[PDB]
Design a protein around this motif. Structure first.
Motif, mmCIF file in Angstrom:
data_model
loop_
_atom_site.group_PDB
_atom_site.id
_atom_site.type_symbol
_atom_site.label_atom_id
_atom_site.label_comp_id
_atom_site.label_asym_id
_atom_site.label_seq_id
_atom_site.Cartn_x
_atom_site.Cartn_y
_atom_site.Cartn_z
ATOM 1 N N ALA A 19 20.082 -1.883 16.813
ATOM 2 C CA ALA A 19 20.243 -2.832 15.684
ATOM 3 C C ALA A 19 18.807 -3.493 15.410
ATOM 4 N N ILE A 20 17.542 -2.931 15.511
ATOM 5 C CA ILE A 20 16.377 -3.612 15.425
ATOM 6 C C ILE A 20 16.290 -4.208 14.014
ATOM 7 N N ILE A 21 15.725 -5.211 13.819
ATOM 8 C CA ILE A 21 15.671 -6.131 12.569
ATOM 9 C C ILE A 21 14.543 -5.518 11.701
ATOM 10 N N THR A 22 14.630 -5.503 10.408
ATOM 11 C CA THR A 22 14.152 -4.826 9.539
ATOM 12 C C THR A 22 12.250 -4.753 9.614
ATOM 13 N N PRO A 23 11.727 -5.841 9.909
ATOM 14 C CA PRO A 23 10.284 -6.119 9.967
ATOM 15 C C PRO A 23 9.892 -5.225 11.231
ATOM 16 N N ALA A 24 10.534 -4.767 12.078
ATOM 17 C CA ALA A 24 10.000 -3.885 13.023
ATOM 18 C C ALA A 24 10.911 -2.570 13.034
ATOM 19 N N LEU A 25 10.583 -1.908 11.501
ATOM 20 C CA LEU A 25 11.143 -0.835 11.673
ATOM 21 C C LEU A 25 10.062 0.080 10.846
ATOM 22 N N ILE A 26 10.949 1.469 10.271
ATOM 23 C CA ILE A 26 10.109 2.253 9.669
ATOM 24 C C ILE A 26 8.854 1.620 8.855
ATOM 25 N N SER A 27 9.396 0.536 8.164
ATOM 26 C CA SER A 27 8.238 -0.254 7.748
ATOM 27 C C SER A 27 6.971 -0.298 8.152
ATOM 28 N N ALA A 28 7.067 -1.335 9.332
ATOM 29 C CA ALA A 28 5.818 -1.594 10.069
ATOM 30 C C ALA A 28 6.095 -0.940 11.495
ATOM 31 N N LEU A 29 7.002 -1.207 12.339
ATOM 32 C CA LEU A 29 6.892 -0.669 13.561
ATOM 33 C C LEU A 29 6.801 0.772 13.649
ATOM 34 N N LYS A 30 7.276 1.515 12.961
ATOM 35 C CA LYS A 30 7.168 3.037 13.053
ATOM 36 C C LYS A 30 6.546 3.426 11.789
ATOM 37 N N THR A 31 5.396 3.473 11.822
ATOM 38 C CA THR A 31 4.433 3.811 10.580
ATOM 39 C C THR A 31 3.049 4.162 11.062
ATOM 40 N N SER A 32 2.420 5.122 10.578
ATOM 41 C CA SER A 32 1.098 5.643 11.010
ATOM 42 C C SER A 32 0.178 5.613 9.729
ATOM 43 N N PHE A 33 -1.044 4.999 9.957
ATOM 44 C CA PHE A 33 -1.920 4.537 8.733
ATOM 45 C C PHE A 33 -2.885 6.099 8.625
ATOM 46 N N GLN A 34 -3.056 6.539 7.325
ATOM 47 C CA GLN A 34 -3.903 7.805 7.219
ATOM 48 C C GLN A 34 -4.867 7.458 6.064
ATOM 49 N N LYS A 35 -5.721 8.002 6.030
ATOM 50 C CA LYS A 35 -6.699 7.944 4.689
ATOM 51 C C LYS A 35 -7.067 9.245 4.289
ATOM 52 N N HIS A 36 -6.108 9.871 4.042
ATOM 53 C CA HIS A 36 -6.367 11.222 3.291
ATOM 54 C C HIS A 36 -6.896 10.938 1.842
ATOM 55 N N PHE A 37 -6.458 9.924 1.173
ATOM 56 C CA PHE A 37 -6.565 9.574 -0.202
ATOM 57 C C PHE A 37 -7.990 8.899 -0.544
ATOM 58 N N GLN A 38 -8.737 8.619 0.706
ATOM 59 C CA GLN A 38 -9.877 7.781 0.575
ATOM 60 C C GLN A 38 -11.154 8.742 -0.134
ATOM 61 N N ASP A 39 -11.921 8.244 -0.914
ATOM 62 C CA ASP A 39 -13.051 8.776 -1.606
ATOM 63 C C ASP A 39 -12.849 10.274 -1.860
ATOM 64 N N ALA A 40 -11.609 10.503 -2.685
ATOM 65 C CA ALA A 40 -11.107 11.961 -3.086
ATOM 66 C C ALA A 40 -11.405 12.019 -4.521
ATOM 67 N N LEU A 41 -11.109 10.873 -5.530
ATOM 68 C CA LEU A 41 -11.082 10.957 -6.732
ATOM 69 C C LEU A 41 -12.761 10.774 -7.161
ATOM 70 N N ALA A 42 -13.520 11.747 -7.580
ATOM 71 C CA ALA A 42 -14.605 11.589 -7.821
ATOM 72 C C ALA A 42 -14.933 11.156 -9.191
ATOM 73 N N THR A 43 -16.344 10.586 -9.399
ATOM 74 C CA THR A 43 -16.954 10.300 -10.760
ATOM 75 C C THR A 43 -17.550 11.448 -11.473
ATOM 76 N N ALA A 44 -17.657 11.458 -12.663
ATOM 77 C CA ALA A 44 -18.212 12.437 -13.395
ATOM 78 C C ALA A 44 -19.670 12.804 -13.055
ATOM 79 N N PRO A 45 -20.156 14.016 -13.022
ATOM 80 C CA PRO A 45 -21.164 14.408 -12.357
ATOM 81 C C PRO A 45 -22.487 13.668 -13.227
#
Lengths: 50, 50
Positions: free
Chosen positions: A1-27
């Protein structure tokens, strides 16, 4: 019965940067319509004869 | 003999440092009531199992 702050929200979550610098600008296309002229002072003056 | 006030007032004397550190109160009295925990972080989360 862990409290929500230490749940899937924050405790169980991994940061990823797949969306970084993917939307390009017009050539860049200014070269096709314009030409580059260097300068080495405050202004540039152009003159032709006729 | 017959020395002007400036020469007497002039720093013929040595300057010591026994004055400094005399009132240096010993720090770290808070360790008796508190424990030091490194953060390396914007915030800290503490959650224990029962």
């Amino acid at each position: 019965a862990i409290i929500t702050p230490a749940l899937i929200s924050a405790l169980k979550t991994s940061f990823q940067k797949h969306f970084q610098d993917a939307l390009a600008t017009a050539p860049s296309t200014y070269l096709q319509v314009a030409t580059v002229i260097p300068s080495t002072t405050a202004s540039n003056t152009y003159g032709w004869l006729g």
